[PDB]
Amino acid sequence: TGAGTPSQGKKNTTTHTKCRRCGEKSYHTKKKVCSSCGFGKSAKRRDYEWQSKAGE
Amino acid sequence: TVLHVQEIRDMTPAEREAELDDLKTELLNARAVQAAGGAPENPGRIKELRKAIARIKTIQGEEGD
Amino acid sequence: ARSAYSYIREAWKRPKEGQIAELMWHRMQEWRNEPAVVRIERPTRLDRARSLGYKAKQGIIVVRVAIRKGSSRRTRFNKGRRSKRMMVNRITRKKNIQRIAEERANRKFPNLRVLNSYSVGEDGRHKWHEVILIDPDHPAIKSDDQLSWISRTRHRLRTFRGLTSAGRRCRGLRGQGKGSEKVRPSLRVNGAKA
Amino acid sequence: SWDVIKHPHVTEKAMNDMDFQNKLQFAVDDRASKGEVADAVEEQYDVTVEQVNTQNTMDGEKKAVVRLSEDDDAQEVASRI
Amino acid sequence: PVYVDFDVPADLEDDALEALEVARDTGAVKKGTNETTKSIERGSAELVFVAEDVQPEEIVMHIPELADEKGVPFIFVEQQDDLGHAAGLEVGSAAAAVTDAGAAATVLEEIADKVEELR
Amino acid sequence: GKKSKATKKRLAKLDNQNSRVPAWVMLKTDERNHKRRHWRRNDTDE
RNA sequence: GCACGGAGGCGAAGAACCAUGGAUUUCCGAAUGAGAAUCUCUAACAAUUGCUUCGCGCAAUGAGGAACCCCGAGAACUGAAACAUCUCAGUAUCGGGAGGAACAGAAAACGCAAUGUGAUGUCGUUAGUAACCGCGAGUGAACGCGAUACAGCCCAAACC
RNA sequence: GCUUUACUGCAGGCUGUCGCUGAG
Ligand SMILES: [Cl-]
Ligand SMILES: [Cl-]
Ligand SMILES: [K+]
Ligand SMILES: [Mg+2]
Ligand SMILES: [Mg+2]
Ligand SMILES: [Mg+2]
Ligand SMILES: [Mg+2]
Ligand SMILES: [Mg+2]
Ligand SMILES: [Mg+2]
Ligand SMILES: [Mg+2]
Ligand SMILES: [Mg+2]
Ligand SMILES: [Mg+2]
Ligand SMILES: [Mg+2]
Ligand code: NA
Ligand code: NA
Ligand code: NA
Ligand code: NA
Ligand code: NA
Ligand code: NA
Ligand code: NA
Ligand code: NA
Ligand code: NA
Ligand code: NA
Ligand code: NA
Ligand code: NA
């Protein structure tokens, strides 16, 4: 079976959903953790410095 | 408009509540007429009815009911 | 005449001698069955605490903290590293155990602030220190002309910024002259070179 | 504080229920239970509510189908508004 | 415990505390370990009391040997608050000193004897 | 699929946001809905 | 309101509009009764603490913020025309935390060695000087001086 | 990337010593 097109057919699972905390569709409903704001893992909001050029 | 602030304050706590429940019903019947696509409207009032209600509520808080 | 305190001090100069020696052998046994952070009604070293700022007053807390001995508990590298940085065993942290203690204690008492801390011995693997903490919200401390300074907002979380006792000493700020070129007025401002 | 009744839901189907089954349909706040819907209705129109059916609509609001006792007449209650 | 080498019978203790109370009213007494310590050093101490329920034990450790090399007699009390109350304090006390008894210099002197004998 | 009362509310808003700028606004502005979302060509969140 | 339509309305009971103060202020959210993709289930400072009338009674913490600041963790590409110490660099990045600024600070100092200076930052200079270093490549201060601004105190103990 | 008696190091294992550690 091709890992391409023919393997695209089984993708009827729901994972990342609208996050109750930040409103982005990144709340992983299996993990109960948001990939965007960290809701469900961190009380503090997710944020890293590599999200921007070092000097900015 | 047809209902000023002085007049709301010249009411007794029991008169505002009576006036309130009065406006709420005018409003509620206004909305029913609108919900039925009713044209006998006068948009300026359904708007006023909301402001009058706010004022009354505002005063109720000021006077302590 | 010598203060009664002066005796408590004298005894602790050589914690492995005479009476205090047998006291430690006794205590530690109970200590090793105690938690990481245990509040205690009275300082084991009265002279010490009082000397540091302690007072048998409302809003003043003391707690004994157990920290593991030895170098840094470090994980080996999982990617490319030059020999110099393939280190594991001999690497030691730049924060002394006493300072770790101060922090652990402080976290256990979120509303309190660290005043000072002192050692109370160690066995083969532990190291115990007692930390004096203060409730910057309790009047009597707000009203104490000798401690009310710690109630100031500018002092929120003193330990975590190293504004402590051992904090400043650990930051190499002891000397005012030669040697402190990279220490004062702050390690970070000196580009982290001490 | 929110009010239970929002406004009368008037549509061809609502009409049929009112004319043929003595039922009044309303747009009610979605936090309102059938019982709350029942009381509010009786108090607002002075009638006897027999049964209430609810449905959360694809309009973001809750719809309530209220049946009045044979004693009352929906057609008449609705005609005064 | 570590600074306690002999046990004081319940009764002896009572005669001791009894003497202390009359001491505070008839003579002079020092309340608190510090004040107690200075007495032994300044020699003005005739009889010194030391609790057995003191924690930490460092606060008192020195009393015994300090008193032995100063000739001043000392006795052990079991309860810390009994010593306090007896000395006339609303709080407890780790140690006390009878600085010149009063209407008890007799009974007292004999308690010192009873203890010396208690080895 | 089984949707919840909250979900249903959202899908609902989206459907509404999928109406066209009323004619009157055209006149009142002397003269486009950039948020037009087809159910087949577009994909909603969640 | 943007927004110049239609209908209607408000304003001399001084509206619009602006300033300050006040009312209201759904749900999720540190999110704190418990659970949950913004809803639900049967009184709530959840959790950790301080005081304690030992009762959540009185209080604290939590999270945010453009960067700045302070305390910890800590690369590699690269340079050395290879490369290992060295360099990139205590940089990037990561953990913890404060403020409106932080940090530092009233000598167990300096050491133009003196019959001298006199808390601390910072700026200019001292200086690519001294010092480091396969003594390669590279790395790199301080005292002092001139300025800015200046400010000096509180415990522990002895004796009570 | 991989290999090894290539160069340099780093974990890990074994072993001596110190501290925990005391009585005859
Ligand atoms: Cl702190
Ligand atoms: Cl000079
Ligand atoms: K390198
Ligand atoms: Mg693949
Ligand atoms: Mg249903
Ligand atoms: Mg439609
Ligand atoms: Mg909650
Ligand atoms: Mg390389
Ligand atoms: Mg190279
Ligand atoms: Mg600075
Ligand atoms: Mg070369
Ligand atoms: Mg360098
Ligand atoms: Mg110098
Ligand atoms: Na704290
Ligand atoms: Na250094
Ligand atoms: Na509606
Ligand atoms: Na779609
Ligand atoms: Na508001
Ligand atoms: Na709280
Ligand atoms: Na309580
Ligand atoms: Na090269
Ligand atoms: Na190469
Ligand atoms: Na080198
Ligand atoms: Na000169
Ligand atoms: Na390869």
From Swiss-Prot, chain B:
Query: According to its record, what are the GO cellular component terms?
Result: cytosolic large ribosomal subunit
Q: Which SUPFAM superfamilies match?
A: Ribosomal protein L29 (L29p)
**Which InterPro entries has this protein been placed in?**
Ribosomal_protein_uL29, Ribosomal_uL29, Ribosomal_uL29_CS, Ribosomal_uL29_sf
Keywords tagged on the record: Ribonucleoprotein, Ribosomal protein, RNA-binding, rRNA-binding
Any single GO BP term:
translation
Family membership = Belongs to the universal ribosomal protein uL29 family.
From the Swiss-Prot or TrEMBL record, give the protein name. Large ribosomal subunit protein uL29
Q: Which organism is it from?
A: Haloarcula marismortui (strain ATCC 43049 / DSM 3752 / JCM 8966 / VKM B-1809) (Halobacterium marismortui)
User: Upper taxonomic classification of the species?
Assistant: Archaea, Methanobacteriati, Methanobacteriota, Stenosarchaea group, Halobacteria
UniProtKB/Swiss-Prot annotation, chain D:
Return the protein name: Large ribosomal subunit protein uL23
UniProt function note: Binds to a specific region on the 23S rRNA. Located at the polypeptide exit tunnel on the outside of the subunit.
Kindly state a single biological-process term from the GO annotations of this entry: translation
Q: Which gene encodes it?
A: rpl23
What keywords are assigned to this protein?
Answer: Ribonucleoprotein, Ribosomal protein, RNA-binding, rRNA-binding
MF terms per GO, please?
rRNA binding; structural constituent of ribosome
The similarity comment for this entry is: Belongs to the universal ribosomal protein uL23 family.
Indicate the quaternary assembly.
Answer: Part of the 50S ribosomal subunit. Interacts with protein L29 and weakly with protein L39e.
- Name the HAMAP family for this protein: Ribosomal_uL23_A
Is DNA-binding there in the keyword field? Answer: no
GO cellular component entries: ribonucleoprotein complex; ribosome
- The UniProt record lists the keyword Iron-sulfur: no
Q: Name one Pfam family in it.
A: Ribosomal_L23
Which Gene3D superfamilies would you find in this protein's record?
3.30.70.330
From Swiss-Prot, chain E:
Q: Which domain of life is it from?
A: Archaea
UniProt cross-references to Pfam families, sorted A to Z: Ribosomal_L7Ae
Q: Keywords on this record? A: Cytoplasm, Ribonucleoprotein, Ribosomal protein, RNA-binding, rRNA-binding, tRNA processing
Question: Which InterPro entries does the UniProt entry name for this protein?
Answer: eL8/uL1-like, Ribosomal_eL30-like_sf, Ribosomal_eL8-like_CS, Ribosomal_eL8/eL30/eS12/Gad45, Ribosomal_eL8/Nhp2, Ribosomal_eL8_arc
**Where, subcellularly, is it found?**
Cytoplasm
Q: What is its main location?
A: cytoplasm
Q: Say if the entry is tagged with keyword Membrane.
A: no
Gene Ontology terms, MF aspect: ribonuclease P activity; rRNA binding; structural constituent of ribosome
One GO BP on record is: tRNA 5'-leader removal
Gene3D superfamilies linked to this entry: 3.30.1330.30
| GO cellular component entries | cytoplasm; ribonucleoprotein complex; ribosome
Instruction: Please describe the quaternary structure of this protein.
Output: Part of the 50S ribosomal subunit. Interacts with protein L15e. Probably part of the RNase P complex.
The family this protein is said to belong to: Belongs to the eukaryotic ribosomal protein eL8 family.
The protein here is known as Large ribosomal subunit protein eL8
Species whose genome carries this gene? Haloarcula marismortui (strain ATCC 43049 / DSM 3752 / JCM 8966 / VKM B-1809)
Q: What gene is behind this protein?
A: rpl7ae
Swiss-Prot record, chain F:
Q: Name one Pfam family in it.
A: Ribosomal_L39
Q: Which gene encodes it?
A: rpl39e
Q: Which GO terms describe its biological process?
A: translation
Q: Which PROSITE patterns match?
A: RIBOSOMAL_L39E
What protein family is recorded? Answer: Belongs to the eukaryotic ribosomal protein eL39 family.
List the GO terms this entry assigns under cellular component, sorted alphabetically: ribonucleoprotein complex; ribosome
Matching entries from SUPFAM superfamilies are given as:
Ribosomal protein L39e
Any one GO molecular function term? rRNA binding
The record's note on quaternary structure and interaction partners says: Part of the 50S ribosomal subunit. Interacts weakly with protein L23.
Q: Which domain of life is it from?
A: Archaea
| Naturally occurring in which organism (per UniProt) | Haloarcula marismortui (strain ATCC 43049 / DSM 3752 / JCM 8966 / VKM B-1809)
Record keywords: Ribonucleoprotein, Ribosomal protein, RNA-binding, rRNA-binding
For this entry, the protein name equals Large ribosomal subunit protein eL39
Describe the task this protein carries out: Binds to the 23S rRNA. Forms part of the polypeptide exit tunnel.
Which ranges form a coiled coil? none
Q: Per its UniProt record, what InterPro entries does this chain match?
A: Ribosomal_eL39, Ribosomal_eL39_CS, Ribosomal_eL39_dom_sf
